């Protein structure tokens, strides 16, 4: 691990490095009492903007509170002055394309099993105001039963083949729409065994993606083809929403096929806060203590505003947790 | 793995991805008969420029023919036009600094144990005209005994300024042997201290520190060891210690090498060896090949020649 990074994080002793990249270093953690395996992601906190840290600490608080069978579970977070430590579900089946490579290309039935896992996880996270924004194959981890866990939700604040044109142009984009594009590209790869946009040269690849023209092989069924074209759509306004996707017959036709699907976790019911009076004193207090919410008045404003936001989401998650 | 990559490499079945980065993607491989595990590194030849591809394939050709107990063994090389597949020794003990984290800092005696492994491996590779040039802690793998295997020799052109000598940081022409010595000094310091000699929260300032080359040497570091570190982390590459000097150092003191020979004339060139060299691929310009074999200088062309000659022997 990095120099000066503790040998223990909470009850977890740090063992070998599992992997690393720009968003941090991952080590295997062992619980000192129960000896359970976790993956611990270590993030350097000194090299982040304060606005970034705020956004991150917010998404983190949400992710710690929710659970989905196809989202890598964030169990806890630990902080010292320099390093942030994320305690994550430990999975070791590899990544989704390892499976794809072995098969060459997947049948529409198998591709769709994976697609339903991915869409379900995205729908869930989007419902809690969390977009991925950087969805790519290495984020699609496999457990031992060959089921997906999507990793790295909320890490974006800290590749071009899977990015939508608006991301490639560094424009200000809808996160949900970016995830839809990325999922389209991944669905394509599952069905074809090749990418819709590829080039030996970077500069050329970027233009292909921005242009958004790709060829679909005949062996992709027409129902599925109409789904792919709606997702891999350059006009973000015209691009399918997750709502459109989940209403689509090809999608729906996959329910419990070939196998029964994991239990659907309950989504928290989020309501309006008409006035200061309707805010729970103990939940407000616990939120106010967090750090990213140290300014009580700005916290009150964000909770009472008409806008949907992560402040409201956290509040209702905590409220739900109390009951 | 990468799309378009093989499902089988020689007798090895490709399984899960082990890790990846700029220099390629590593997959777990399983021998279809013996069930022996290997690590298979996949590298995209097409993304590479002309001179880079050649430099890499030349060094891989040397690496596949030699073996040292502290260098990650390269067993073989396979190629489809799109991908190179490097079949490597499989190691899973973690990396050196995982050990360092558990201890905090090493005793001078324990640090010397690792240091001798590292220097031994580099002296072996340098003897075969191979410098690492990009030595960093994550290259220092551990097997199950907590012994070192240095990985990623030959990959530097496919590309951590904390470990790079000032000449490498400055992007100037340099002796690769001298760069490795600097990187080993920084690593040795880290094992003894549990902190880097040059560190900074901002990249720009870190490069400056490395270039100026001033660092704080803790009092608990023994003075003959302290003299070693000063000789290695020396900004003047002409003044910096050689591996030969390191191996004779009082603190330091406490595998078959093949020797390059001269080829005065074309008549001295074994036709079987040349044919094997022609078949490698990193030698497109065959006139340039011959010039390099007949030149007055040590080079990787001669090294490959003599490794092939010895192997036929």
């Amino acid at each position: 691990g990095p120099l000066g990074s503790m040998q223990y994080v909470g009850p977890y002793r740090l063992e070998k490095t599992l992997g690393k990249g720009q968003t941090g270093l991952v080590k295997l953690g062992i619980h000192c009492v129960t000896c359970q395996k976790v993956a611990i992601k270590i993030v350097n906190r000194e090299k982040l903007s304060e606005s970034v840290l705020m956004k991150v600490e917010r998404e983190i608080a949400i992710l710690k509170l929710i659970e989905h069978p196809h989202v890598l579970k964030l169990h806890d977070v630990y902080e010292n002055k320099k390093y942030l430590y994320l305690v994550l579900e430990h999975v070791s089946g590899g990544e989704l394309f390892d499976y794809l490579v072995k098969k060459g290309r997947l049948t529409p039935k198998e591709a769709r099993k994976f697609f339903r896992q991915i869409i379900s996880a995205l729908d869930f996270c989007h419902s809690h105001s969390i977009c991925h924004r950087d969805l790519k194959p290495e984020n699609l981890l496999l457990d031992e039963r060959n089921n997906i866990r999507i990793a790295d939700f909320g890490m974006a604040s800290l590749s071009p083949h899977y990015a939508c044109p608006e991301v490639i142009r560094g424009e200000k984009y809808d996160g949900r729409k970016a995830d839809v594009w990325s999922c389209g590209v991944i669905l394509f790869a599952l069905l074809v065994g090749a990418l819709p946009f590829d080039d030996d040269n970077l500069r050329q690849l970027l233009e292909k993606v921005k242009r958004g023209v790709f060829h679909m092989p005949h062996f992709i069924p027409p129902d599925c083809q109409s789904l792919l074209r709606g997702m891999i759509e350059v006009d973000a306004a015209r691009r399918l929403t997750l709502e459109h996707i989940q209403k689509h017959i090809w999608y729906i036709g996959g329910k419990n096929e070939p196998e029964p699907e994991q239990p659907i976790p309950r989504k928290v019911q989020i309501r309006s806060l008409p006035s200061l009076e309707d805010i729970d004193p103990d939940v407000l207090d616990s939120m106010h203590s967090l750090g990213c919410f140290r300014d009580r008045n700005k916290l009150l404003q964000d909770l009472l505003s008409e806008e949907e936001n992560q402040e409201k989401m956290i509040y209702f998650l905590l409220l739900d947790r109390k009951l």
Side-chain angles (χ1 to χ4, degrees), chain A:
Chain A
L3 287 169
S5 85
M6 351 157 156
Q7 192 192 151
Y8 292 85
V9 178
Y12 303 102
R13 192 200 322 131
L14 300 195
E15 308 287 328
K16 64 189 232 196
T17 293
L18 292 179
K20 72 207 80 182
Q22 203 57 221
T23 65
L25 180 285
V26 182
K27 293 176 99 178
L28 165 63
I30 310 293
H31 194 271
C32 64
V33 179
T34 68
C35 261
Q36 299 189 45
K37 282 168 271 66
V38 301
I40 294 199
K41 181 148 194 163
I42 301 167
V43 179
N44 176 24
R45 299 192 327 120
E46 300 197 343
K47 69 157 288 179
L48 299 177
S49 158
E50 294 187 14
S51 299
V52 171
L53 267 188
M54 265 180 289
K55 291 185 189 298
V56 177
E57 185 175 344
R58 266 212 317 260
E59 304 224 339
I60 277 172
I62 295 180
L63 293 156
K64 192 166 66 180
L65 293 174
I66 63 173
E67 191 166 33
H68 184 283
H70 302 294
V71 177
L72 198 65
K73 177 60 179 149
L74 173 60
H75 296 291
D76 213 335
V77 178
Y78 287 94
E79 188 185 84
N80 66 43
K81 198 192 63 174
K82 183 189 184 180
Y83 286 125
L84 200 62
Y85 301 85
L86 275 54
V87 180
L88 297 169
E89 177 183 4
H90 170 75
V91 88
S92 60
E95 70 173 75
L96 195 265
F97 279 14
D98 297 341
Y99 185 72
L100 178 57
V101 161
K102 299 185 187 181
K103 311 287 262 170
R105 72 175 164 99
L106 303 187
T107 53
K109 280 190 187 185
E110 195 162 11
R112 177 211 260 160
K113 166 235 269 161
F114 293 120
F115 186 68
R116 286 185 130 263
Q117 302 185 347
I118 293 169
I119 291 293
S120 177
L122 281 177
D123 173 278
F124 188 78
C125 290
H126 287 181
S127 294
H128 297 83
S129 307
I130 301 291
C131 296
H132 197 285
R133 300 163 199 275
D134 192 50
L135 195 67
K136 58 205 161 307
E138 66 174 324
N139 299 129
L140 309 172
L141 313 176
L142 294 179
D143 67 22
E144 295 317 312
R145 288 180 207 291
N146 222 44
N147 295 316
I148 291 174
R149 301 286 190 288
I150 296 186
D152 286 334
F153 269 104
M155 309 309 291
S157 329
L158 315 193
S159 41
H161 292 92
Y162 306 92
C164 69
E166 58 262 30
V167 157
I168 295 189
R169 287 186 293 250
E171 293 164 331
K172 203 159 189 179
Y173 59 89
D174 186 340
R176 317 208 193 284
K177 251 49 207 306
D179 287 349
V180 164
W181 174 280
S182 302
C183 293
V185 174
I186 291 161
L187 212 210
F188 187 91
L190 292 179
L191 293 160
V192 180
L195 291 172
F197 309 107
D198 207 345
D199 197 288
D200 16 329
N201 167 266
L202 175 88
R203 206 145 288 171
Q204 270 134 73
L205 178 267
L206 301 167
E207 307 294 352
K208 275 195 62 189
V209 177
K210 286 186 273 158
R211 176 143 181 273
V213 180
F214 61 100
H215 168 68
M216 289 186 65
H218 67 281
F219 57 70
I220 302 184
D223 45 357
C224 183
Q225 293 209 18
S226 76
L227 218 204
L228 277 172
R229 295 227 182 200
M231 299 170 72
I232 314 185
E233 163 67 59
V234 164
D235 186 340
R238 197 179 289 133
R239 192 175 301 158
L240 292 189
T241 59
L242 279 196
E243 196 81 349
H244 294 150
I245 302 311
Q246 295 175 95
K247 287 158 68 173
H248 192 289
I249 194 71
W250 190 80
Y251 186 86
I252 289 164
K255 186 187 198 315
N256 293 327
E257 193 178 37
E259 315 184 302
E261 309 187 327
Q262 294 298 116
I264 294 85
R266 201 176 153 189
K267 294 193 221 315
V268 162
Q269 22 180 333
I270 167 177
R271 337 164 204 246
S272 68
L273 296 169
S275 87
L276 218 191
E277 244 210 306
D278 306 313
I279 299 181
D280 181 275
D282 333 335
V283 179
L284 185 63
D285 287 340
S286 68
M287 275 187 87
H288 180 221
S289 73
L290 286 187
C292 61
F293 301 121
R294 280 300 171 79
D295 189 310
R296 180 168 276 240
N297 286 109
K298 193 207 181 304
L299 203 177
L300 293 180
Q301 181 175 11
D302 292 344
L303 293 176
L304 299 165
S305 78
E306 298 161 298
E307 184 185 25
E308 220 99 335
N309 59 33
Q310 289 175 344
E311 284 77 20
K312 289 187 176 64
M313 184 69 246
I314 296 170
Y315 173 88
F316 290 108
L317 281 162
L318 285 179
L319 190 68
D320 183 50
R321 168 83 71 183
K322 189 59 248 166
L323 329 157

